[PDB]
Amino acid sequence: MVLEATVLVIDNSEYSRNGDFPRTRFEAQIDSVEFIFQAKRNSNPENTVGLISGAGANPRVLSTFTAEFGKILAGLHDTQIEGKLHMATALQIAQLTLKHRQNKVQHQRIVAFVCSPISDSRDELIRLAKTLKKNNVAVDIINFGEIEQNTELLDEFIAAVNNPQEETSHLLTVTPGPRLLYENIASSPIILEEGSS
């Protein structure tokens, strides 16, 4: 399926501090990713992902490019759990990240947790979405927000990224209750179904 690089954007933040489903949202985010990546790396081996900090007050990559269990290895340690959005920046790097994605013909993909209230400007958001689309990035977002984070940038954004869907963007805005994220997203063409473009 997928031959592309991907990004894991994690907010460990106002929501991931705050467990969305067991054990905590942050933790809940976790195994879903291994779930995600498993499939992603099952989509094809060599489907590569990043992992960054959109969390805390410090943006940065967590897991750099690889396949690869090293991510699962890299994700091994924590984050600021109550931390805050780097997205615009963090995303922006994910672009630069993906720009450097090793052995391109791998398309640029991004997977993004929303544990934050999502502070950004539509313009920047769209310029990103543009820049993504400009860079031709795949972006599928994980959002369980207050409200959720939606009727907002995120909803616009996926669109604002999107001329063709997985060549640009898909979305799933994560649901509350007995919603296992990996169970949640199993449906959404964030994963499975059609996997890349």
Binding site: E14, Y15, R17, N18, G19, D20, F21, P22, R23, T24, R25, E27, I81, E82, F144, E146, P176
Partner: protein
């Protein structure tokens, strides 16, 4: 306010999934205490707002989900309040008793992070007026604790200084303390939202401890920093400010007029002002009057130019590091001080000018020589 009750519903469902921050017992007890806007500190993001100073009796009900504090609201999260906010329950006891609850023991944050609780619990004992000996010992261990740590919180120091301030606040040594709190201000400087009664009174007590410093003068200080208006203003802050004037003016009865008990409680400022008037006059004399390699200042009229007199010159001037400061010595006969430094200052405005002059001067007259030497 339901803002608790709200969150005592909402953040119970805020991710935080229908939590102990919504329990049949739970929402009642506030409503039981009040809906009336004065409350028990409301369980996460709003208790994270709420210090709420009706003494939390969700004392217990914050202490719910503290089981799940692993997978429930997790941070420091705790002495964020309680051990802070209920540290302000203000008994001996109280905190001692929830020392006796936590004692910085609880599952992971402290007894499996809780160092800042180690700060608190220990520090918090200290703010209870605990015996000096007992304090300092483990305080210095608390210090020793503090020592080898790389702690991203100032809060630790911001505990500890405030703590160790409080320690010296139990004490004199505002030379330390004031400075310690001065330190602590600089320790609070980046962080730590507070209250004014906190702010001024401390910064008062600080500014007090400046005079209960007094010092290596000072003169000028953190006054620049937002302790002022804020503190001064009024009451002794008037004085305290006018003492900054005294830190310049050095007129006894621009102050010894002012004096009420609290200041005259330590009369030695009358001395310290003599120390001031000397030192105050001194610094600029040292700073300015000679510029031309300032030293001599020797002695008497020059020293009485402090408008503190020759026979006190015979002491205050005579005392040097017997002032704590002056270097050099005395030619008594010729009535001449020998002097040297240990006169620093924070000021500006002056040798700025004088600076580059000589520094251009040789520089210029270099080029005369500096013309052909290697050139020719």
């Amino acid at each position: 306010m339901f803002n608790n009750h709200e969150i005592d519903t909402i953040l119970s469902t805020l991710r935080m999934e229908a939590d102990p921050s919504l329990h049949p017992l739970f929402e009642q007890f506030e409503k039981f205490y009040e809906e009336k806007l004065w409350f028990q500190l409301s369980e996460s993001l709003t208790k994270f707002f709420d210090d709420a100073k009706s003494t939390p009796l969700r004392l217990r009900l914050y202490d719910n989900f503290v089981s799940k504090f692993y997978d429930k609201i997790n941070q420091l999260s705790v002495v964020k309040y309680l051990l802070a906010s209920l540290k302000d329950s203000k008994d001996f006891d109280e905190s001692l008793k929830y020392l006796d609850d936590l004692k910085a023991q609880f599952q992971e944050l402290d007894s499996k992070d809780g160092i800042l609780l180690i700060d608190s619990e220990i520090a918090r004992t200290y703010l209870l007026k605990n015996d000096l000996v007992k304090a300092r010992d483990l305080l210095d261990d608390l210090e020793k604790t503090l020592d080898k740590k790389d702690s991203i919180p100032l809060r630790i120091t911001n505990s500890f200084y405030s703590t160790n301030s409080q320690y010296f606040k139990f004490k004199n040594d505002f030379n330390s303390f004031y400075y310690t709190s001065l330190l602590y201000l600089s320790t609070l400087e980046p962080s730590t939202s507070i209250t004014l009664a906190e702010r001024q009174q401390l910064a008062y007590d600080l500014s007090i401890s400046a005079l209960l410093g007094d010092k290596i003068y000072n003169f000028g200080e953190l006054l620049h920093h937002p302790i002022m208006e804020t503190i001064v203003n009024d009451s002794n802050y008037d004085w305290l400010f006018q003492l900054l004037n005294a830190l310049t003016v050095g007129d006894f009865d621009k102050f010894d007029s002012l004096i009420k008990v609290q200041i005259s409680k330590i009369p030695i400022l009358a001395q310290h002002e003599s120390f001031l008037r000397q030192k105050i006059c001194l610094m600029t004399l040292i700073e300015t009057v000679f510029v031309k390699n300032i030293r001599m200042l020797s002695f008497e009229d020059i020293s009485k130019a402090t408008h503190l007199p020759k026979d006190n010159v015979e002491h205050l001037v005579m005392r040097a590091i017997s002032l704590g400061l002056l270097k050099g010595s005395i030619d008594q006969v010729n009535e001449l001080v020998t002097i040297s430094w240990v006169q620093p200052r924070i000021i500006s405005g002056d040798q700025i000018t004088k600076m580059k002059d000589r520094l251009v001067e040789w520089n210029d007259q270099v080029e005369k020589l500096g013309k052909k030497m290697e050139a020719r």
